[PDB]
């Protein structure tokens, strides 16, 4: 298989105008579950999730997220009192794991305050990295509970990966298909690719035999139909002809377009 990932995000907003809590799960780029403080229900965001998970799953996790929502509100209260901040501020959490092609795995868990890194977990040293002293105070409390850290490591390395495999099988028709890119060159040379899945794609320009960087890269954008599009541009020297070629790598296939 290609590289896949599972990550769950939580957002807390302290003085919302708009939910004060949101939690969404992804497999790769695909939303799979959603919850917010308005609906107070955990719901599938993909047909192959709804199809494969019984009502007791959604019932159980609905209850857990109602609790997590409260814990998030309280932690947000503590961070703002300590930063001595007034007004609306945000608190975010990201957890998840990757299953790489070679079978190796990664695992990560992080927190953010106003969209900046706050606490980053290290499952190998069983420790927390703090970006400032408010974060340092929390670190010391969290690190004093050894069992919780150990719990975090086990979940990231085993449970997260097992969940990910389960979801991969649920949505294999979606997650494991390949739609190769359509690639053309426009004229300043633009190399355009579209209609491809997965979104991971590598586009670059070469001048003669060396990788040219003076290249302008377009972002990888959703086309709204489940496929993606992107581009990369370079500027042609007006005074000396060169051999320019667009190179595209996508799902183990390399492609060259010479001009």
């Amino acid at each position, epitope marked *: 298989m290609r590289t896949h990932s599972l990550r769950y995000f939580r957002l807390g907003v302290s003085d919302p105008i708009v939910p004060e809590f949101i939690s969404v799960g992804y497999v790769d780029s695909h939303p799979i579950t959603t919850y917010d403080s308005v609906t107070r229900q955990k719901e599938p965001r993909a047909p192959w999730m709804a199809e494969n998970l019984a009502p007791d*799953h959604w*019932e*159980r*996790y609905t*209850q*857990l997220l*109602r*609790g*997590w929502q*409260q*814990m998030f509100k309280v932690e947000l209260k503590r961070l703002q009192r300590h930063y001595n901040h007034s007004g609306s501020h945000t608190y975010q959490r990201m957890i998840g794991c990757e299953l790489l092609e070679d079978g190796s795995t990664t695992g990560f868990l992080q927190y953010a305050y106003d969209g900046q890194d706050f606490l980053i977990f290290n499952k190998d040293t069983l420790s927390w990295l703090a970006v400032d002293n408010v974060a340092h105070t929390i670190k010391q409390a969290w690190e004093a*509970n050894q*069992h*919780e850290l*150990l*719990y*975090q*490591k*086990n*979940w990231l390395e*085993e*449970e997260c990966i*097992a*969940w990910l495999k389960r979801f991969l099988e649920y949505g294999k028709d979606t997650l494991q298909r390949t739609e190769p890119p359509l690639v053309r060159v426009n004229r300043a040379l633009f190399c355009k690719a579209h209609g491809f899945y997965p979104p991971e794609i590598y586009m670059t320009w070469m001048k003669n035999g060396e990788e040219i960087q003076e290249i302008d890269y377009g972002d990888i954008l959703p086309s709204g139909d489940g496929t993606y599009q992107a581009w990369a541009s370079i500027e042609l020297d007006p005074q000396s002809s060169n051999l320019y070629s667009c190179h595209v790598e996508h799902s183990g296939v390399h492609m060259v377009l010479q001009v």
Partner: antibody
Framework: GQNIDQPTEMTATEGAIVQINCTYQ??????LFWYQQHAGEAPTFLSY??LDGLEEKGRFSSFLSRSKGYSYLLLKELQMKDSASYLC??????????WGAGTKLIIKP | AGVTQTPKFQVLKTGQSMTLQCAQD?????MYWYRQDPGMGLRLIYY???????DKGEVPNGYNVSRLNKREFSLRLESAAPSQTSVYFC??????????????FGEGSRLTVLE
């Protein structure tokens, strides 16, 4: 998960050592707890394992093998007050607790 | 004080209503009601993940509950049955979901239901 197994009853001698087994077959794993319950009383927390290994805490030790799906509670230098039931509990993938039927430990003075 | 539940003992005739009380002064978010019967492990009746929500456990039939506030979680027997003869345990934890958090148990309530 599905089930937790621990022996119904164990009898050992004062001063000696006893090892209480707990095997689990569960849907996912988020930790194994041991609780002590004296006859007619509330169970109370003894230990927690989630990664492989042995964790010591006084006369009591706790072992875990995730791959073998078993844990044991080790009691050294047994005293009469260790007479109690010991309850094994596992947290599954959905953070729900599955409880063993308990092991009643009897100490011969 | 920990977890306080009442009554310590109770006799009930078949068909009778009953309410078990439980409070915890540890500012815990999660509370639970279990029953303990000979030859089997604790079975969850109902639980409350945090203030404001409750849900069925493994054996909800015959029972219902109320998370009255953050401290209190009472268990109700609708129409007492002989099979509901048991020892009932209230428990609480700081937060369910937190993987390594232990339960704190109350002293138990011994119920005997007779025809």
């Amino acid at each position: 998960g599905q089930n937790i197994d621990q022996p119904t009853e164990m009898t050992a001698t004062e001063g000696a050592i006893v090892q209480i087994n707990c095997t689990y077959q569960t849907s996912g794993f988020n930790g194994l707890f041991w609780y002590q319950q004296h006859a007619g009383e509330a169970p109370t927390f003894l230990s927690y394992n989630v990664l492989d290994g042995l964790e010591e805490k006084g006369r009591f030790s706790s072992f875990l093998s995730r791959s073998k799906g078993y844990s044991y509670l080790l009691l050294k230098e047994l005293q009469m007050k260790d007479s109690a039931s010991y309850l094994c509990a596992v947290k599954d993938s959905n953070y729900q607790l599955i409880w063993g039927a308990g092991t009643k430990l009897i100490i011969k003075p | 004080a920990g977890v306080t539940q009442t009554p310590k003992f109770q006799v009930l005739k078949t068909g009778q209503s009953m309410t078990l009380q439980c409070a915890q002064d540890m500012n815990h978010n999660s509370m639970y009601w279990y029953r303990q019967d000979p030859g089997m492990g604790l079975r969850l009746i109902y639980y409350s993940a945090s203030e404001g929500t409750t849900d069925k456990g493994e054996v909800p039939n015959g029972y219902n509950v109320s998370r009255l506030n953050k401290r209190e979680f009472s268990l109700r027997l609708e129409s007492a049955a002989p099979s509901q003869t048991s020892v009932y345990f209230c428990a609480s934890s700081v937060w369910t979901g937190e993987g390594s958090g232990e339960l704190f148990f109350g002293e138990g309530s011994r119920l005997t239901v007779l025809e």
